[PDB]
């Protein structure tokens, strides 16, 4: 099980990133990235001449070039301040010394040297005389160290985190440590858009990332540039970038709907969630692709919302994807607690009497039927025949048919009266375009 990541020094990737950053226009950055990609692909072809089935891909480098898209790794639990503290402890620098103070209050320009806003620059300056000139770490080793640190933070252990960071410091140069700090903070400031990186990687990569939301599948499937994908559509157990809504002017709203009847709906304040159901296997995904299934329960036996709605689905429905909003319900009043004071629906305390309610507003797949390409009206009709609502635990958002502006102003006035954010408008013939904004969904506020 040989992997190219074990043969690629981390210094090469660091140098490529530095060259990309220190470039004027997009052309040079794209040229450097393409050269690195071509070298990696040639090495992959040379290494895997004999093996038939290969799981090796460009993911090991991709997860570092775009840390913000990493989902397999959990939160590191360390930011600028904690990293500065750990560097002070491990390097045995004096607590009250100049270097420690500079690292801690990095935002203060009192230093008058280097940069007063970039922590990575100051870390590099501090580590320049305390670090070797050549490293001996590979991409696979760095990935393993990061995985160990993340898991160990998840396990409530700090001595092992200190050991891993100490190993990284002892086996890295100043530039490598600076880049590692940048990846840990999950910012690189390369100056090149993620869309540009995906486009240079493959002709059709942004769409696949929108549909799947996992760098592993994109890196694995889209290896040979010549070979493409015939059809890419929403798939079970794979997060998809939700479709958002854009500001709308009440004056020309009818024009935005091609002079046709539209749907008026109430704006729901809370989390944006999507539910994947296959038999009794449940998966929940958040707005950006994070897995919240642990909170809400991945099985009917144990959970915070699923144990009660297991049996709320009509018998016919076996495979089902839904998109909706999660909010807090107060039963003693039978009213929704507006987002803000006294509660957060993301980390609700168990002892509270408030509970979790899911308001659905779209369906994307029912019994291996792909409803992404159908009109909004059809998806609404199919949604009506999925679950029998059980108030307090799962509901369908009401939409009212309206074809005049007076109706829109009436709805907005009533919403303000009921102390809601505003109202949104949906085009009956709008198709679901993942990750796009202002295509068939509009929002209006006072």
């Amino acid at each position: 099980s040989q992997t190219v990541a074990s043969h690629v020094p981390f210094a090469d990737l660091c140098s490529t990133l530095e060259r990309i950053q220190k470039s004027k226009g997009r052309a040079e950055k794209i040229r450097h990235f393409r050269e690195f990609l071509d070298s990696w692909r040639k090495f992959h072809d040379a290494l895997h001449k004999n093996h038939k089935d290969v799981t090796d891909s460009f993911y090991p480098a991709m997860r570092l070039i775009l840390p913000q898209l990493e989902r397999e790794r959990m939160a590191y639990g360390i930011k600028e301040t904690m990293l500065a503290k750990l560097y002070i402890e491990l390097l045995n620098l004096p607590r009250d010394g100049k270097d420690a103070l500079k690292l801690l209050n990095y935002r203060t320009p009192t230093g008058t040297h280097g940069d007063a806003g970039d922590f990575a620059m100051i870390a590099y300056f501090v580590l320049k005389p305390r670090c070797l000139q050549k490293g001996s770490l590979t991409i696979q080793q760095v990935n393993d160290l990061l995985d160990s640190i993340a898991s160990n933070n998840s396990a409530k252990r700090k001595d092992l985190i200190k050991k891993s960071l100490l190993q990284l410091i002892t086996q890295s140069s100043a530039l490598e440590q600076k880049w590692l700090i940048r990846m840990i903070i999950k910012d690189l400031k390369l100056g090149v858009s993620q869309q540009t990186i995906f486009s240079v990687f493959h002709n059709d990569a942004a769409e696949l990332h929108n549909v799947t939301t996992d760098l592993e599948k994109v890196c694995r499937q889209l290896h040979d540039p010549s070979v493409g994908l015939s059809d890419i559509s929403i798939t079970l157990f794979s997060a998809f970038k939700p479709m958002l809504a854009a500001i709308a002017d009440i004056e020309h709203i009818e024009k935005d709907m091609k002079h046709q009847s539209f749907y008026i709906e109430t704006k729901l304040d809370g989390e944006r969630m999507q539910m994947h159901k296959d038999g009794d296997v449940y998966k929940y995904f958040s707005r950006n692709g994070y897995n919240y299934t642990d909170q809400f329960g991945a099985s009917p036996t144990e959970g915070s919302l699923t144990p009660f709605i297991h049996n709320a689905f009509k018998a016919d429905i076996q495979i089902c994807i839904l998109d909706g909003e999660m909010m807090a319900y107060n039963p003693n009043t039978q009213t929704f607690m507006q987002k803000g004071t006294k509660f957060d629906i993301k980390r609700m305390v168990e002892d509270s009497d408030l509970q979790t309610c899911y308001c659905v507003f779209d369906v994307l797949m029912v019994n291996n039927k792909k409803l992404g390409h159908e009109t909004l009206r059809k998806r609404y009709e199919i949604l009506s025949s999925i679950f029998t609502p059980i108030p307090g635990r799962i509901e369908i958002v009401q939409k009212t048919q309206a074809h005049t502006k007076n109706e829109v102003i009436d709805a907005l006035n009533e919403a303000i009266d009921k102390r809601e954010e505003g109202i949104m408008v949906k085009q009956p013939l709008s198709i679901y375009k993942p990750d796009k904004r202002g295509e068939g969904w509009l929002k209006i506020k006072p």
């Binding site: 043969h7 690629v8 090469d12 140098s15 070298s39 040379a46 290494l47």
Partner: peptide, 26 residues
């Protein structure tokens, strides 16, 4: 398998500003 060493190899307009000294000597 050749080593990784082999596979990487590492208009406009003119602007003018006059500056006249105002000292007593001038």
């Amino acid at each position: 398998m050749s080593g990784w060493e082999s596979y990487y190899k590492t208009s406009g307009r003119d602007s003018l500003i006059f500056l006249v000294d105002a000292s007593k000597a001038m």
